[PDB]
Amino acid sequence: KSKLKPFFALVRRTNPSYGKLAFALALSVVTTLVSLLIPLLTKQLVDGFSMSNLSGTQIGLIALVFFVQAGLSAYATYALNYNGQKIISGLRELLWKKLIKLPVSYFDTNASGETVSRVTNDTMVVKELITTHISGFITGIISVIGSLTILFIMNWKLTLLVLVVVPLAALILVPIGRKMFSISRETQDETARFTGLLNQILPEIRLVKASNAEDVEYGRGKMGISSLFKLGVREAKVQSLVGPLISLVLMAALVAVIGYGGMQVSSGELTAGALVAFILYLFQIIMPMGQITTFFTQLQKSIGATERMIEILAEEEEDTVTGKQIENAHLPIQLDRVSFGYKPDQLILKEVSAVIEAGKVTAIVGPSGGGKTTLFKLLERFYSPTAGTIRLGDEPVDTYSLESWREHIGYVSQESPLMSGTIRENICYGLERDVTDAEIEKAAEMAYALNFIKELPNQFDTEVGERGIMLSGGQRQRIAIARALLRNPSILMLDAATSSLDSQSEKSVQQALEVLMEGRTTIVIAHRLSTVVDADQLLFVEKGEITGRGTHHELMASHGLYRDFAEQQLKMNADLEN
Amino acid sequence: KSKLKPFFALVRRTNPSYGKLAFALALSVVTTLVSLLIPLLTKQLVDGFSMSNLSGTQIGLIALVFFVQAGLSAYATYALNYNGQKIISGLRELLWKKLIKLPVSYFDTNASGETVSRVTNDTMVVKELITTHISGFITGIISVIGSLTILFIMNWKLTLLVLVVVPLAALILVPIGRKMFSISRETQDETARFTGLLNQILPEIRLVKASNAEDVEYGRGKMGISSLFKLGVREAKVQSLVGPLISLVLMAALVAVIGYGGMQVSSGELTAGALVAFILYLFQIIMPMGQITTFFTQLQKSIGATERMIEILAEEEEDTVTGKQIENAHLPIQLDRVSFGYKPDQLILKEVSAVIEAGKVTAIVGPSGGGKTTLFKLLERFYSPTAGTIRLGDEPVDTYSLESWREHIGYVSQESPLMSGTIRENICYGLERDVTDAEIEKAAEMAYALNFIKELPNQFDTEVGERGIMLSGGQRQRIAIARALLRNPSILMLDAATSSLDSQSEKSVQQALEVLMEGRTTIVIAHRLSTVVDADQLLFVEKGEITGRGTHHELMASHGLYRDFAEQQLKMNADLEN
Ligand SMILES: CCNc1cc2oc3c/c(=[NH+]\CC)c(C)cc-3c(-c3ccccc3C(=O)OCC)c2cc1C
Ligand SMILES: CCNc1cc2oc3c/c(=[NH+]\CC)c(C)cc-3c(-c3ccccc3C(=O)OCC)c2cc1C
Ligand SMILES: Nc1ncnc2c1ncn2[C@@H]1O[C@H](COP(=O)(O)OP(=O)(O)OP(=O)(O)O)[C@@H](O)[C@H]1O
Ligand SMILES: Nc1ncnc2c1ncn2[C@@H]1O[C@H](COP(=O)(O)OP(=O)(O)OP(=O)(O)O)[C@@H](O)[C@H]1O
Ligand SMILES: [Mg+2]
Ligand SMILES: [Mg+2]
C-alpha cells in the first residue's frame, strides 16, 4: 500500500541514476533563478544601457555570454534524459534478471507472451515522467514558492488566502489522480494482452492461412486494438479535466482575493497598485500550478503503469543455494511415493515409486495422457513433488544444489525446441567452455546430424529462424538430440527423441547412443515399443500410476495390457509382409 | 524518396482523423489570438477598470467567463489527443490487415517476432508527435507570423534582417534533422530486434532452465538492452544540440539588428524606443522558434521510426482474385514437372510428377530431409511452384481462387500447432458457421479426443495456453486431427498426424479416419510404414525426387531401398517376441 513508497523503491533499486541528478537539479534551480531575475534587471538595464553602442562593445559581450549560459541550461535537459534513460534501462535489467529466474510454474500460470510486453512496453511509459515532468515539477515548485514569498512580502492576509485555496486544488485533483491510476493500469494490461495475442497468432501463420481464418483473426485482432483506443481516449478525456478545474480553483482564489479584498478594502487597497500587482502575480503563479498538476497526473499514470511490474520483482527465484555439488551421479535414482499435480486439486501422479538403475536403460512406456513427461519434469526438478521426494543413494534430491543437478542431466523434450540463430548456437547452448569444434562434430555424428548439416552452408548458421522453422520436423529433433549429447551427461533423458524421424535415422541414432551411453544412466520414452525391447527395465505408466515394472519379457508375460500394447504393434508389422 | 510525402500518405490512409482536426485547429488559432490579445487589453484595463468594485459586480463576470473560455482551449488539447489516438489506432488496423495477408514466404524470410514489435511499439512513437507537437508547431508558427507582421509595421529593414537570419537556422538545423532520422530508425530497429529475441527466448523457458543457460541468456538479453540505452542516449545527445544552436542563430540576428542598427543609427534609432521594442519582440519571437524547432526534430524522428513500417504496407497480399469457385474437388490431383525451392538457388523438389488419385489413400513416404512437407506446402498453395504447375482434371490449380481451395483441404501439420484459448477455439477455427455441440463432438470422437477431453473441466477450455503447453505432446496432435476432421474436407492431408501418440490411440484414430474418409481423397505421410501398408498408392520421396511410385507390394518387390526401409522395420518388431 502507499503506492509512492514501492514506486520510489523500485526506482532506487537502479542506483547509478542517483549521482548526476543532483548536478542536474542544481543547474535547473539556477536557471530558474536567472529566469526569475531577467525582467528585474532588463527594464532598468534598458534605461541604464542608454548608450547601446558603448554598452555593447565591451560589456555587450556579457549580453551574449549569458545567452550561451542559457545554452548551458540545455545541458540540464540532456542530463535528465541521460539519467532518465538509465533508470528505465536499469528497470529492464531488473526484470530480465527476474523473468528467467522464476520457476517454471509461474510460466505455466501466467502466459509469458504478455510478460514480454510488460518488460518492453511498460518501462517506456516510465520514460516520459522522468524525462520531462520531473524538471517541470521542480521548476514549477520553485517558481511557485518564490512568487509565494514575493506576494507574502506584499501582503500578510491574501497570501494566506491563496495558500488556503491551494489545498482545495489538492482535494479537487485527488479523484482525477485515482482515475488516471486506474486508466493507466487497464491500458497497460490491455497492451500487454494485445501483444500476447499477436505474438501467439503470428508465428503460427501457417495455421492461419490453412484454416482460412484470415478474416476471423483480423477481427479478433481489431477487437484488441479497439480496447486500446477506448482506453487511449478515456484517459485523454480525464486529462482534459485538469485544465478547467485548476483555473476554476484560481477563480475561487480570485473571489477570495476579492472577498477579503472587499473586507480589507478600507485599510488595504489604499495602495491599490499593491492589489493590482497581487492580481498580476496571481496570473504568474497560475502558470506553474498547471505545471505541477501535469506532473502529479503523470506520476499517478506512471504508478498505474508499473503497479503490475512492481510484483514481477517479488516472485522468489530459486537457483543454487545448498551448494552440495553432486559428486558421483552414478547412483540409482530412487523414487519414494512421489505424487505431483500441476494444479493443487487434481493429482497427475498418484504415489509413483520406481528405481531407475545406474548405468542401464529404463524405458517409461505407456498410453498418452498417462503422465510420463511430467514424471521427467519431476525427475529434473523443474517443479517439486507434493508427496515424498526423490533420492540418490538414500539422500533426498533437495540436498543437492540445482546447478550441480542440471549440469549432469541431458534432457531432450517432447517438442525439441530450437531457438533462432546458428546451428552452433543450438547444438552448444549455455556451455561455458569453448566448444572445441571437434566436440561439436563428434556430438553431431553421434546424433546422425553430420550428414544433413554439411549439405547446407555449414554448422555455421542455417539460421534455424523462429522456432526452428527453417529446418524440418525430423532435422530439428536430430539437432536437439545433438544438443543433449554434446554435454556428455551422466543421466540422459530422451522424451521421445526418435518420434518424428524415419526408420533409418532411428536405427543410426539408436546405435550411436547405445555405443556412447553404455556406462551412464539413460531414461527413454518409447511410444512405439520396437525401440526399447532391449531395455533393462520397463515402467508401464497409466493414469499417473506405475501399473507394471520389470524387464520386457517378464512384464509382457505378466502384464495383460502391455501384451496387447505389444501384440497390436506386432500385428501391423506382422501384417507388413502379409 | 521525399520522406514527407509517403509519411503523410500513410497518415491520410487513416481517413476519419481528417474531420474534427479542423475544429481543433480553429479553436487553437483563436486561443492563440486571445493569448496575443490579453496584455494589450489588460494594461489599460487596469487603468480603465480602476472602479475595482463596480467593475467586478456586473462586468466582472466577464473577467470570470473568459477564463473558462480558456477552459475551452483545453478541449482543443483533448480534441488533438482523440484525433491523435485515432491516427495511431488507424495505423495498427492497417498493419494488422496486412501482416496476416502477406504470403508465407515473407514470414520465412523476415522473422515475424520482430514485425509484432513493429506493429505494437512503432506507432506508439507516432503518438507523441501528433498529440502535442502539431499543436506546438501551429501555435508557434502563428505567433511567429504575428510578431513578424508587428515588427514589420515597426521597421522595414530589420524585419528583412531577421527573415534572412531564419533561413540560416533552417540550414543549420538540417543536419540535426538527418541525425534524428537515422537515430530514430536504428532505435526502432533495435527495439524490434530486442522484442524478437525476448519473445523467442521466453516461451522456450524449459529449454533455458534445463540447459542451465540462465546466465548466458541473461547476458544475451543484457547486451540487447545496452544497445537500446546507447541508442536512447545518443538521440538525446543530439536533441540537446537544438537548444544552443537556435539561440546561436538569434545571436547572429542580434548582431544583425545591431549591425544594421549601427548602419541605420543615424536616421533610424532616432526613436530608440522603437529599437528597444524591436529587441523585446525579438525575445518574444525566440520562444516560438524553439517550439517550431522541437516540432521539426520530432517530425524527423517520427519519420525515422515509421520508415520501416511504410513498406510493410507495400507487400502485395494475394487472396481470392480469380473467383473460379471449386465445384467438384473429387478429381485426381495431377502434378506435372514440378520443382520448387525456398531460396531461388537451391532446389528442394527437382521435377516431381505424381498423380494423387481421387478417393484413395496415397502415402508419401521417405527418409527425413527428403522434401515431403514441402510437397504438401506446394499442394496447398502456400507457395507456388517454379516449374510447371498442379492440375485438377487437366486444369491448372492457379485457375481456382485460393479461398475455394483452402476451404476444401484439411491439413494437419508436422507440429500440430495450437493457439491459446479454449479447446472449442482450436477444434473449430475460422468456421463461419455456428459449430453445433453435436458437430464438435462427432468430430472430437472421430479423432479419439472425446475420452481425454471429458476427464478435464470440458471442451470449454482446459485453456491450452501459449503454444498448447497445458496439454501433452499426444493430446495436442489429437486435437489437431480433430480440427482437420471438423471441417468435413474433400482432400485430407495428414503430415504425420500419428507421430507422437501411442499405439492404441493410433489404431483407434486410424479406424475412425478410414471409416469417415472412404469416399474422399486422403494423403498421409507415414514415418513408420506399419500405418500405411494398406494404402492404395505409395510415393517414395528421396532428395526431392520421387524414386518409386506404386502399391506397397509391387514397390517393395521392385524397389531395393524401400524393402530395406521396410525390412529393418520388420526386424525390430520381428525381434519384439524374439
Ligand atoms: C490541462 C489543459 N492544459 C493547459 C491549461 C492551460 O491553462 C492556462 C491558464 C491560464 N490562466 C488563465 C488565463 C493561462 C494564461 C494559460 C493557460 C494555458 C496556456 C499555456 C500556454 C499558452 C497558452 C495557454 C492558453 O490557454 O492561452 C491563454 C493565454 C494552458 C495550456 C494547457 C495545455
Ligand atoms: C533544446 C533545449 N530546449 C530549450 C531551450 C530553451 O531556450 C530558451 C531561450 C531563451 N532566449 C534567450 C534567453 C529563453 C528566454 C528561454 C529558453 C528556454 C526556457 C523555456 C522555459 C523556461 C525557461 C527557459 C530557460 O532556459 O530559462 C531562461 C529564461 C528553453 C527551454 C528549453 C527546454
Ligand atoms: N502445464 C502443464 N504441463 C504439462 N502437463 C499438464 C499441464 N497441465 C496439466 N497437464 C496434464 O498433464 C498431462 C500431460 O503430461 P504427460 O506426462 O501425461 O504427457 P505425456 O505422458 O508425455 O503425453 P504422451 O504420453 O501423449 O506423450 C495431461 O493429462 C495434462 O492434462
Ligand atoms: N523455410 C523453410 N521451411 C521448410 N523447409 C525449408 C525451409 N528452408 C529450407 N528448407 C528445407 O526444406 C527441407 C525440409 O522440408 P521437408 O519437406 O524435407 O521436411 P520433411 O520431409 O517433412 O522432413 P521429415 O521427412 O523429417 O519430416 C530441409 O531440407 C530444409 O533444408
Ligand atoms: Mg519434416
Ligand atoms: Mg506427452
Side-chain angles (χ1 to χ4, degrees), chain A residues 139 149 261 461:
Chain A
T139 77
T149 318
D461 54 0

Side-chain angles (χ1 to χ4, degrees), chain A residues 85 100 108 121 200 206 209 212 214 217 232 368 403 420 429 478 498 502-503 506 528 569 573, chain B residues 85 100 108 121 200 206 209 212 214 217 232 319 368 403 420 429 478 498 502-503 506 528 569:
Chain A
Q85 284 280 14
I100 73 165
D108 285 332
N121 299 355
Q200 290 172 354
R206 279 81 188 288
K209 301 282 172 183
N212 204 16
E214 304 160 311
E217 284 306 335
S368 45
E403 288 292 320
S420 45
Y429 192 58
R478 303 218 281 265
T498 174
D502 56 61
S503 281
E506 175 190 283
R528 286 180 176 85
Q569 263 297 334
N573 211 353
Chain B
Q85 284 280 14
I100 73 165
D108 285 332
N121 299 355
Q200 290 172 354
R206 279 81 188 288
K209 301 282 172 183
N212 204 16
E214 304 160 311
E217 284 307 335
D319 204 82
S368 45
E403 288 292 320
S420 45
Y429 192 57
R478 303 218 281 265
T498 174
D502 56 61
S503 281
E506 175 190 283
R528 286 180 176 85
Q569 263 297 334

Side-chain angles (χ1 to χ4, degrees), chain B residues 92-142:
Chain B
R92 285 153 157 175
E93 274 182 1
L94 268 296
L95 268 64
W96 192 241
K97 193 183 310 175
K98 180 68 65 159
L99 285 182
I100 73 165
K101 290 228 177 186
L102 261 68
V104 306
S105 87
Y106 169 81
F107 287 143
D108 285 332
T109 292
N110 282 359
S112 38
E114 302 156 10
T115 50
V116 307
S117 177
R118 293 287 165 63
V119 154
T120 313
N121 299 355
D122 160 74
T123 54
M124 190 177 289
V125 155
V126 184
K127 178 204 181 193
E128 279 298 334
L129 164 58
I130 286 299
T131 182
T132 77
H133 304 296
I134 187 67
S135 86
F137 165 77
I138 183 54
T139 77
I141 192 77
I142 191 164

Side-chain angles (χ1 to χ4, degrees), chain A residues 108 342-343 346 348 366-375 377 383 414 495 527, chain B residues 206 456 469-475 500-501:
Chain A
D108 285 332
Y342 293 77
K343 310 174 203 65
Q346 53 156 333
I348 309 197
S368 45
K372 308 179 257 194
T373 298
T374 193
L375 188 143
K377 276 171 184 152
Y383 317 88
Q414 271 184 354
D495 204 6
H527 289 307
Chain B
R206 279 81 188 288
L456 274 36
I469 205 63
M470 288 212 199
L471 292 195
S472 50
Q475 284 150 344
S500 199
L501 54 88

